[PDB]
Amino acid sequence: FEADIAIPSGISRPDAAALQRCEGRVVFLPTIRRQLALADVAHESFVSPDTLGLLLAYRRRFPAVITRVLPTRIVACPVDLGLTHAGTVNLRNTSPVDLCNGDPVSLVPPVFEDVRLESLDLTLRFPVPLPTPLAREIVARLVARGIRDLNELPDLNVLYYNGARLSLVALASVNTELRSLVLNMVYSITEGTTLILTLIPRLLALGYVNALLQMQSVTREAAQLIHPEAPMLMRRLPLYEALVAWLAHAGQLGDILALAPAVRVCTFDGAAVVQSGDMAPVIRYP
Amino acid sequence: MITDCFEADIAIPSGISRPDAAALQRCEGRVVFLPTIRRQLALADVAHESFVSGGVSPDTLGLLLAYRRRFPAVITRVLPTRIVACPVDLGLTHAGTVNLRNTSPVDLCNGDPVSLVPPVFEGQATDVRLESLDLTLRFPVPLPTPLAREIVARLVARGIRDLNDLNVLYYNGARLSLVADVQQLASVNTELRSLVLNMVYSITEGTTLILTLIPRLLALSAQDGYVNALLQMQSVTREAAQLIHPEAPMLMQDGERRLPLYEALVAWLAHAGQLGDILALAPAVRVCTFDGAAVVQSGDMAPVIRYP
Amino acid sequence: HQPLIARDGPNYMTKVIDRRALNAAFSLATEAIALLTGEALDGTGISLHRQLRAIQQLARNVQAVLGAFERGTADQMLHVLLEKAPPLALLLPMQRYLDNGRLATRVARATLVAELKRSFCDTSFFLGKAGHRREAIEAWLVDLTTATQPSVAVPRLTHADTRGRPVDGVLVTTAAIKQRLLQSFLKVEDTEADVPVTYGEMVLNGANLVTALVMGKAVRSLDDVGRHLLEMQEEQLEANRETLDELESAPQTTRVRADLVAIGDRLVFLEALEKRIYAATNVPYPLVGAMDLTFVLPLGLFNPAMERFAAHAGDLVPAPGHPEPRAFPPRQLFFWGKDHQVLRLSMENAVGTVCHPSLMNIDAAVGGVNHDPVEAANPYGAYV
Amino acid sequence: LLPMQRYLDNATRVARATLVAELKRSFCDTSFFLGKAGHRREAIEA
Amino acid sequence: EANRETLDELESAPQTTRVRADLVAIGDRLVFLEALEKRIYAATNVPYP
Amino acid sequence: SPVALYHQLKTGLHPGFGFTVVRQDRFVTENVLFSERASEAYFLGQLQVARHETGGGVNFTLTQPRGNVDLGVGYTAVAATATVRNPVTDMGNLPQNFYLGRGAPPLLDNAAAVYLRNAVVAGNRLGPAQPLPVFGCAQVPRRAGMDHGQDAVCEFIATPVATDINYFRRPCNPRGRAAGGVYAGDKEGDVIALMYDHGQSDPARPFAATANPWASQRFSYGDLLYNGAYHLNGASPVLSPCFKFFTAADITAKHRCLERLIVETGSAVSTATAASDVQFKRPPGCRELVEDPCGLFQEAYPITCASDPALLRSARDGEAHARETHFTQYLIYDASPLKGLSL
Amino acid sequence: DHGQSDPARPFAATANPWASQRFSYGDLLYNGAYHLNGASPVLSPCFKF
Amino acid sequence: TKPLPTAPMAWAESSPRELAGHAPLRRVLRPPIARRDTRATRDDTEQAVDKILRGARRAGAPRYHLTRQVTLTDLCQPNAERAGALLLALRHPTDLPHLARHRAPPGRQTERLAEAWGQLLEASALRAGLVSFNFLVAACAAAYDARDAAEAVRAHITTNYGGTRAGARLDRFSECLRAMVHTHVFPHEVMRFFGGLVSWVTQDELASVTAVCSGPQEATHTGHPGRPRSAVTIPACAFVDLDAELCLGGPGAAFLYLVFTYRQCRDQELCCVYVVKSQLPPRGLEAALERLFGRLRITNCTYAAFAELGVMPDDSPRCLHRTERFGAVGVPVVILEGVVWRPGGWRACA
Amino acid sequence: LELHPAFDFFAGVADVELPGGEVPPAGPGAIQATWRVVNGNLPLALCPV
């Protein structure tokens, strides 16, 4: 299956040439649908959201790989369906990281650095097809970056993958782009560690439940308790009510920072490592 | 069709009354917990008498705890002689799209993952009973994941009150309440042990740096309405700063080569955000209506595309 | 239609069809698909002689599959009849009761359960017990044959002798017994029997329904409905009339080798199947069954007054000057184990049923007795 | 043998066991025969 | 053809003669009932096995 | 007291109890059928080829829908039981443990409880090798080697010493008061009225209410151990023979029609499994078909048994040669189906 | 193994301690392994037990 | 070529439904909807041209995803091991010395993993390669339960693998694995599944291995026209069931997994690679890891790490336990049958 | 621990020569052996009164 995205008329010579460039690039679309407008794809369809808003958006929208581009319409095969139908669909790196064979690949919003069409008067931002072991790392480095601006290290800004060096600095606009995640990653921990601390000395419910807990708390949790409750304390405290409020909130952030793989690269008669800027054969099917 | 579909065939016996047999024709979009992936099974292995242990059929909080030991599958078509269900994990269909049915009181959206929950709601525990065979079919309820974590959370919190209201919910302005029910303590013990081991392991030395930032948040919640709404009116940290003055130690053991907060996040994500997946089962199903609408109401079918 | 006898002084049967399904697995292998498909073929005879090897592997497997179904039936029947079959020991009381009284007085119902228990206990395994005798066993066979009341169906054809005498039924045993009976207790009065061949068919009077595409609406187009009906109902007769024309046409009886025994007044196929069918498969011969019995052994009970005595004076005498272990309350048993061992079973084995903390769980009782409100008795010893 | 053939037509851990009992008592009995049933006849013929 | 004329079976019958030995009929079959300690093992110090 | 006894029993004392031991057995017989000119109408269908694919290759699986109708009115076919082969279960003495089972509230002292258990389960043919898994069932120790066949599991119903032995010289009911829909009348409460109502008199021996005041009555010491209701031993796998006697909800559930009840003790489903090592409540997958006389009659059968070896040895000579009772001693001589088999 | 029953007569571990158990009195004498009486030509019947 | 067991012989050809389905569509009628109411060769190659036409006049059959990789022959040997073994891809080892500096707990030697890996490059030479599974068993052979069959794994590796001092490759790579867990860089963070062997191409110092990254096993045309068949083989030390150890004897499709066991001690750290066959959900698997391997729990963050490996689609899955020959060495090998490969991702500890 | 008629095997205190003093050490054990002297030293279970 292959959908259609019609380019509306009034295209200059480079605006058709810029869309000729992004051959094998990833596109989010609202629903699997035959006919579709290009304003539904563009950055104007998102409004400007933060890094938190894009990750909630990229779960709800449906990713698709652009196949061969006709001058009138953009043809794009959806990842979830037509790629289980078709055999193997190519995919161009726009990442600085070179993909190896067999890497499960997720997407990241463009936090790093974006084709703009002037005649159609819109911007196009694109996800970054980088591998999933890096994907949970590059986020967590930047979340650790934003916490230090709420009072860093000379390291933590440099990443190594497959012999290649990255620089996450390469800034204050990015820090305000990511400020809402910092306000959720801090609160989900500070709510969390207190409910651990205000329940285990509150109950330690006994027989083998607290004893196996104390076996785990033998200078490991209780020492971490006595170290935190030194700079702390020990009416009705809504303890049981806050657990529901915490498991709903902290359970939500695991969904957002999950970054599930869609792309699984099985190269055949090709390079086992695909470089940056190159196209990679991609399946999501056994 | 072994990899694309997988026709696990629940056989129907000979003696079933035509009012009971035609009661299965309204069992189209359902969820059946297959114990194995055999190609020939019976209703007795599907029905609740397979679910019961020796003398004990567990409560709803325990009724989760052997769903995840089994294989959920959705009925494709109810023939007179058999019922065919494709397992969710192996392969969905030829095209890979199966239809469920909202037995929820809750309307769905497109793209949201769908968790299936035992019948916990009030006026909802509807088990299609075979009078001709003495078999009950406890059909679970497909629910949105922003509910299905809270509904587990109300049940786990109810059992720990019972070791020393809570069963009322809201969703998009719709007030709804679940069945208040006494819980077996054997079921609560594995739940409470699953909390703490994911809570103790979620604490690292770098988290003490984060703890120092609590009076900065109440310094920030007085100006940002976003932070003032984020904490809660009944949050712990708003109360855990007026009695708590946190601090950090000066130096770290081998604090030159290791990252304090980066190790704090990864151990947090691997245990605290992971924790909702361990209580319930995983939402391996989302809804992608191709041409219908954006909101799928109750009682109606919904197309399903598999969910990584 | 029940017989009814006119006395002085002041009916349809509907049975449910059981339904079952039988299975076999035929599977091939990729190696031989390429050949059969024709794909891997070459011009070389070697490529060819590789087919014939993998063409025959169907013939072998197909036959051994199709065969498993004729053995399927012969299996099912034995598995079926066992479920129509009350054991003898329980019947002969019944057939005496149904024939004579067939009456609902509670005493009648009661006097069976006496006769059932004691018939069963005595006659259960007959050839093991009375087997040495003869005039008994000759009368036991005659009971089998007469215990069943004949059935309703009258078949189109009838298994018969060479002479043509009809055959009234089938004994089925193991071979271990069949050899026994054919020596002393019976005589084989025929060798080859005549057996029908063709199966049956059915006559179809159904519900005849139409869905007929129609172009244009007029009487003829509509009358075609009425017409297509007659067309369709005209077709069934032509279908049925063939079957009767076929059943009269086909060959009917052949000659078959099987044993015909004359028991009492009736000829009977005497057959033991464990060779033809159940030999050299993993399936047990269903006719070799099972039993459950349960036994009651008392341990430490104690003799009544009249029953403590000795059959003589010096009967069992301990060595002179020694105590008598006989006169003490006994705490043991003795009995015969399986293989002829003397087992021993004494109190000290009870620990597992007693030392358990359970015997001090009263709480069901106290609540369970106090459901009904109980009166207030003299409270002289219940009150402190 | 005469016990074996009966067993070969059914193989748990249990079935094996009773064979052993079956063999022993069948050996301790029918081992020598014409010295035992020699006076009888119907038994030898069988 | 699945079954065939077995190649083992196409030999013509050999030359049969007449020989004195005892055919006992046990059960349904015939059996040579045979004792060899005269024909063989006689005046030869080999034991009868 | 559960502690006080473990002394008085081990060290040789006789307290004021006595037990009626019970156990189950399985015998492999050889049957015979009979039938008639047409005793069954048999419908056979048409075959169905189902092509499946597998790494090994393609698979064909053939099916032929078949059906059975028994058009005889009355009994048109009969099975009988000829002889008996090897009895499968060894006739042994294996006592039952309740420590395999679970679900009883432990005596309060964590010292005293662990003291008993360690002094019972230890060194036991049966009791658990490992501590109980919190879910599932404790496993019986594996045995190095087996011989006689699987081992029967006895049970012990504590019963007052005074009840006369002469109850046991005839097939009886362990519960001491008869049960079963067979005996009952036509009313609603009948099938219950028999069992637990001690106003009336035992249908088996009308001149008394019961032979076990402890085992007969509702909520007695007897019921509490053996019922489906109380699920006391529901944990453990080991088959408990007396289960079918004391379980109340089963008896009432059965129907009363004798024309039917006969046929349906021909084919009755075992409560045990030969395939297991010792004896196990049957796993739901496998089924054995077994004829239960004791299914209908709610009775059990006595054996040759004695409290002395001496007084036993005189039994093998026959029946009328058996001295029944020496001074306090006694003998029991089996009435059974197996009476004369010399098995 | 005397922590276990006896396949022959399960209710006891052994009929003798002095014989059954490894390094019992008997096994010291009659185990061909220990090779005690191996000198003498006279048969030892129990050697195979 | 049209035999006369026809209803099966036409059924194996890919039916009557496709004939009858095209009958109401295409065979009848003008409806859909209408008005109302030169001696030896040629003809040897000439019929081969016609065989291409026989390849063109026509064309179940399952699909694959074959993969190839140019692979150095230091660690694995696709010539010594037959077709049908597991394979394991790696990350590139230049990420090894930097990640050990941040993932190892304080007080541990982070220089150890960069040194141990550097000694391996000078020991197999007397570049992200590939680890074969049989090579991995002899490395973790000093931690197992059945130690003799682990020496049977070690018996053929030191005699059949190409290279100089293959036992020095083993005892250095096993030292690398003891440096993995000590520097907390767990081997599941490095070992990535690469599909089962079908064929390979020989060249000096490197080999071009073909493998199925996803799909079934036995119907890949191996290249050998007599046998396009190759069963999956696993040595006996790594094969662990959960149907026998948990009394789950029912039929059903059996899954295949890889499992690492971690023992974190002071310079005595164990590694065991097991192949776990199960009838279980992958979410219903971590509780089963708690029941068995609690010994390495106390001596240590989790002790276990696992991922999916493949599925046996059989109702009653069939396994073999034989002694095959790798040259002249008899190794107790658990031969699996009918495996449909579907990979997945590892699961976490920290 | 009953392996022989003529000896006793008990748990001693390993690595202690004797008589050693008032309070033997808590050090580990080892099965020891002594010589029963007369009959009566046979355990009562094995020579009943």
Numbering used by the authors:
A (entry chain R): 6 to 52, 57 to 122, 127 to 164, 172 to 190, 195 to 230, 235 to 262, 267 to 318
B (entry chain S): 1 to 164, 175 to 318
C (entry chain B): 100 to 109, 118 to 491
D (entry chain C): 198 to 207, 211 to 246
E (entry chain C): 345 to 393
F (entry chain B): 1032 to 1374
G (entry chain C): 1228 to 1276
H (entry chain Q): 3 to 16, 23 to 45, 76 to 97, 104 to 170, 181 to 354, 417 to 466
Give excerpts from the publication:
HSV has a characteristic particle structure comprising a DNA-filled capsid (~125 nm diameter), a proteinaceous tegument layer, and a lipid envelope. All three types of capsids have mature angular shells (triangulation number T = 16), composed primarily of 955 copies of the 150 kDa major capsid protein, VP5, arranged as 150 hexons and 11 pentons. Compared to A- and B- capsids, C-capsids have significantly higher occupancy of the capsid-vertex-specific component (CVSC), comprising UL17, UL25, and the putative UL36 proteins disposed around the exterior of each of the capsid vertices and implicated in DNA packing and capsid maturation. The CVSC reinforce the capsid structure to withstand high internal genome pressures and may signal the completion of DNA packing, thereby initiating nuclear egress.
The four blocks can be combined into a complete map that contains an intact asymmetric unit yielding a final resolution of 3.75 Å for the HSV-2 C-capsid. The resulting density map features well-resolved side chains consistent with this resolution, allowing atomic models for all four capsid proteins (VP5, VP26, VP23, and VP19C) and the CVSC to be built in. The cryo-EM structure of HSV-2 C-capsid reveals an icosahedral assembly of ~1250 Å in diameter, similar to HSV-1, HCMV, and KSHV C-capsids and HSV-2 B-capsid. In HSV-2 C-capsids, five copies of CVSC density are arrayed around the exterior of each of the capsid vertices bridging two triplexes (Ta and Tc). Unexpectedly, in contrast to the bi-lobed head observed in HSV-123, only a single-lobed UL25 is seen lying between the space of two adjacent penton-VP5s, indicative of the high level of flexibility or sensitivity to proteases possibly due to the exposure by detergent treatments. A five-helix bundle from five components (contributed by αi from the stalk domain of UL17, two α2 helices from two UL25 conformers and two C-terminal helices, α36-C, from two copies of UL36) and a four-helix turn (the hump domain of UL17) make up the stalk region, which bridges the penton-binding and Ta-binding regions. In summary, a five-helix bundle in the stalk region, a large hydrophobic patch and two sets of three-stranded sheets in the distal region drive the assembly of these five components into the CVSC. We note that one CVSC contacts two subunits of the penton, two subunits (P1 and P6) from single P-Hex and two triplexes (Ta and Tc) in an asymmetric manner. The N-extensions of the UL25 dimer insert a number of hydrophobic side chains into two hydrophobic cavities of Tc triplex, one within the VP19C and the other at the interface among the three components of Tc, stapling itself in the Tc.
